Each structure stands twice: as C-alpha cells, then as structure tokens.
C-alpha cells in the first residue's frame, strides 16, 4: 500500500466510482442513494375469486434402534402434497388465485428442511409475489416436460442431504396468479401510498417509484407505459382518477473544477450535496456555493 482515500465525501465517492485518484474537469452524472425501507402498494382488478392452498409437508426421523447416530443421513422420509391423489396425475390448479405453503414438520432439534429452485424459472416461496400462469400442476413424481425442485435435509454445522424433489409443470398465461395469503381486513384492489418512495405491483407490473395524482383525463385503458416498457401511470377504475409514476432517484449532474465539486445541476428545489445556494435556470435548478458576481 502506498496511499489510500476513504470513499466518504461526495468528491471521494466520485473518485472511487470513477476508479481513479484524480478526475478531469467536466460534468459527471450521479444518482442519489435510494431509501432503505419502502412501503408496499398493490393495485388489482377484482375478478371471480376462488382460492387453492398448495401445501407441502416434510417430515423425517432417524433409524430407531440400537444405533443412535445423529449426524447420519435420515433413512425414512414422509413427504406429502396435500390433495395429491397419486394415480390421478399431477395436482393442477383450477382456481384464479393460489398460495404455496411450506410446513417443515420435523421434530428433531437442529434439523430443518428446505427446498431449492433447481431448474425451474421460479421458487416455491416466491410464486406468491403475484406471478401469473396459464396453467400449473405439482406432483411428487416426474412430469414429462416439467422441472425439478430438490428437497433437502439440513443439520447445523454439518453437511446436508437430498431427501426427494418436487416436480412442477406450467405454461404462460394471465388466468391464474399467486398471492401471499388472504387476510380479512386488507383490500388487495386499491391500497397505495403517495409522495413516498414505494415498491409497487400495479396491474401485474412490478417496480419501485413515487406515485402522485395528476391532470390526465385519458379515456382509453387502465395502464400507460413508455417505449422502454416502464410504467408511467395508471387509472383507478372506480373513480377514474389517473396517477403518475416517477423514479425515486433520477440522475443529477455534478460540476468538478480544480479537483473539487463546485456545482450541481438538479431537477428540484433543494440545497443538495451541501451547497448553500440554489437558483433556477430555464430547464433545471442549479446549486453552488458561489457569489454570482464574476465575469469569466
């Protein structure tokens, strides 16, 4: 080590991000840090609702008898899939909504079950976050054309063992969806927070942004997207009010001169980056520690 700099100040962070100890004069884009705790907002059209609970039970116990080996692999495994009636084929979901639940039913201490993604495009616990399907069926035996999800038995500070797998089949579509769990009291159709950075799921579109009320009286549709596919706004189907969506931290532009930051172009009224004076230009706001009396 010859010399070091801590990435603590605003100029130091720019130097660290640019991977260089010196920065040439010019303009450099940067993004403010995102809030670390985000509320959740959900908007959804009410549809014909019936709810199926997919539940997977895992239990195992050791070989009772003269040899009590704890670290050994479990021998006998009970794995059930609720309503999965063997000969009838995979347990398919017919309901519009469904929820996946996991019941780690082992009693031995320090032993815990788990399920892994495998080669499926989704995870067991993560389907509940409003994932759409055209069809989906689970089974404890291989489905021709499906995917496999390993089921594992774990011991603390010890190596784990596979104790089976869950086979899934699916197709793309908009008819079936996964939800976390019904709770009596909460409206899953229009429950949003305004002017605060929030994580949202609005009419099957997930993202992070800020929601506000706006002018627009657009008559067609319920969602409005940009060329890139990002969601720019949506309409509450009851009132007809249209809400806009803005990113939580759009990029700024810092001005550096003589190895220091002298100004910053901003999109709003704030004395950001520690500058004590802010003015307004035709297209943007400008903040700097300047006295505004120079000529060159």
């Amino acid at each position, epitope marked *: 080590i010859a010399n070091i700099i801590y990435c603590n100040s605003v100029i130091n962070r720019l130097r660290c991000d640019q991977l260089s100890f010196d920065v040439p004069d010019g303009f450099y884009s940067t993004s403010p840090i995102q809030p670390v*705790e985000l509320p959740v907002s959900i908007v959804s059209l009410p549809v014909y609702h019936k709810h199926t609970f997919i539940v997977l039970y895992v239990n195992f116990e050791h070989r*009772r008898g003269p040899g*009590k080996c*704890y670290n050994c692999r479990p021998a006998v495994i009970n794995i059930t899939l609720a309503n999965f009636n063997e000969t009838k084929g995979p347990l398919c979901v017919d309901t519009s909504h469904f929820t996946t*639940q*996991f*019941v*780690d*039913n*082992v*009693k*031995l*201490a*320090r*032993w*815990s*079950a*788990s399920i892994n993604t495998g080669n499926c495009p989704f995870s*067991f*616990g993560k389907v509940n976050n409003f994932v759409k399907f055209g069809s989906v069926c689970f089974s404890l035996k291989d489905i021709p054309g499906g995917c496999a999800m390993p089921i594992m038995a774990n011991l*603390v500070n010890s190596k784990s063992h596979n104790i089976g797998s869950l086979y899934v089949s699916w197709s793309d579509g908009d008819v079936i969806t996964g939800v976390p*769990k019904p709770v009596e009291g909460v409206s899953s159709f229009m429950n949003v927070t305004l002017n605060k950075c929030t994580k949202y799921n609005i009419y099957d579109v997930s993202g992070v942004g800020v929601i506000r009320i706006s002018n627009d009286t657009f008559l067609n549709g319920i969602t409005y997207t940009s060329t890139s596919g990002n969601l720019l706004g949506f309409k509450d189907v009851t009132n007809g009010t249209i809400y806009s969506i803005t990113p939580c931290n759009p990029p700024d532009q810092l001005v550096v001169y003589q190895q220091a930051v002298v100004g910053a172009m901003l999109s709003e009224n704030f004395t950001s980056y520690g500058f004590s004076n802010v003015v307004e230009m035709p297209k943007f706001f400008y903040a700097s520690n300047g006295t505004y009396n120079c000529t060159d």
Partner: antibody, heavy 124, light 106 residues
Framework: VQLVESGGGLVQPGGSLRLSCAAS????????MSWVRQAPGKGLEWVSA????????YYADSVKGRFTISRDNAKNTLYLQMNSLRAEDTAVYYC????????????????????WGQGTPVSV | IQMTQSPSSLSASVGDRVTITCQAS??????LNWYQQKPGKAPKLLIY???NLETGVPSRFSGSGSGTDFTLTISSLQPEDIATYYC?????????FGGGTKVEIK
C-alpha cells in the same frame, strides 16, 4: 449472541404492559422465539411462541386470548402484549431463542432453547 | 402433557454419581431437553434430544432414555453443579416443563 428484556414494572389488576426484548449477535429472522415465565419460587411455565415469519403464533391456555405475541424483524425486536392481567400473572419473564434455524418461507417446529435473556420482573 | 421428576431434591458428596429421572406420562419417543438453572440466573441448555450433549458443557453430564422414562446423570458431582434441573418435552408445540429438582453438596 445476546438477549436483553425490558418493560417490566408494577400495574394494577386489569392493566396492560408492553414487554420488549432486543436481540443481537445472530440472524433474528431465522429463529423462532418464545416467552417463558417463572413464578416466584416456582418452576418454569411456557407462555407463548412465534415462528420466524410470524404467521403462526401459539399460546398456553393460562394466557390464551389475553396476551398477544409479535415480532418486528426489521429491527430485531420481540414484543409481548399483556392485557387484562390477573394476580397469578406476576412472575419473571424471559425471552428465549430456539436452536434450529429455519428458512423464512417455512413454518415449523420449535422447543430447544439454547439462549435465554436475563429476565425482567412483572408485578401486579 | 405432564412431566414428573423424582426425586424432588437430593444431596450428595463431591465426586459422587448423582442420577435424576423424568417421566412423560405419554410416549415422547426421544424429544426431551434438560436445562440447568443456577440460583438467580437464567437457565442453560445441557442436553437436547435426550442424549445429545451440548457443545459448551463438560462431558461429566450424560442423558439417556426413550418413550416414557428418561434419566440425567452427573458422573462426578463438582461444587459448581449446585442448581435446579428441569426436563422439558417438545412433542407437542404447547410444550410443558417439569417441576424441577434441586441438588445439594455435603
């Protein structure tokens, strides 16, 4: 690993309290927690337990319907809500940590507490 | 579920071979914990699964049993072991502790 309880005191019968227990030194959301009380000069009695996620909560019959367990995984804090207290509810309350780590998407067994708090007195 | 431990109290000389039992009044198979509470302090876990010795307690302790009968033994009772011992089952999530048992030196 460390557990510290707080919120003990003296309240009239029929009152309410806000027992709290902070946790540090381990991944808090991976382990189930339970409150267990020791009446003065008596054996330990289990009061309530909550899994890591919080979907499942269990209560003993001597406390069923009167108390309410909760946990806030964002700031490693375990809570116990006491309502409609009686005379026999007076004891020292400990917050305990299970020994089996479990995935956050799972609901499972518990009962092998390896770490215990200092305990706090509650008088009525 | 109910648990009963015998004896309710006992006293033995240093280096002796104290043995304390616990019974479950119901088939518990192997799900039993053994705790130790020194006076005025929080309990500590000694044995889990009725026989698995914990990683921070000396091998002086040992536990055995199955079904309805269980037993905890101290190979050589040292002066540090004066405390109250408890057995706790976890076959049912509405778990219950025993009444305890106290040891004494002479």
């Amino acid at each position: 690993v460390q557990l510290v309880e707080s919120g003990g005191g003296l309240v009239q019968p029929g009152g309410s309290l806000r027992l709290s227990c902070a946790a540090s030194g381990f991944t808090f959301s991976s382990y189930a927690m339970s409150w267990v009380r020791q009446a003065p000069g008596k054996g330990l009695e289990w009061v309530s337990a909550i899994i890591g996620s919080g979907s499942n909560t269990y209560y003993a019959d001597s406390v069923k319907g009167r108390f309410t367990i909760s946990r806030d995984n964002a700031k490693n804090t375990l809570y116990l809500q006491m309502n409609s207290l009686r005379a026999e509810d007076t004891a020292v309350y400990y917050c305990a940590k299970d020994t089996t780590p479990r995935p956050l998407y799972s609901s499972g067994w518990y009962g092998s507490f390896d770490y215990w708090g200092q305990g706090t007195p509650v008088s009525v | 579920i109910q648990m009963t431990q015998s004896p309710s109290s006992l006293s033995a000389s240093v280096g002796d071979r104290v043995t304390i039992t616990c019974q479950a009044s119901q088939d518990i198979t192997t799900y039993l914990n053994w705790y130790q509470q020194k006076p005025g302090k929080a309990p500590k876990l000694l044995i889990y699964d009725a026989s698995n010795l914990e990683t921070g307690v000396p091998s002086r302790f040992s536990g055995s049993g199955s079904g309805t009968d269980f037993t905890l033994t101290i190979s050589s009772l040292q002066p540090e072991d004066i405390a109250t011992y408890y057995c706790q089952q976890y076959d049912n999530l509405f778990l219950t502790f025993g009444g305890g048992t106290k040891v004494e030196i002479k």
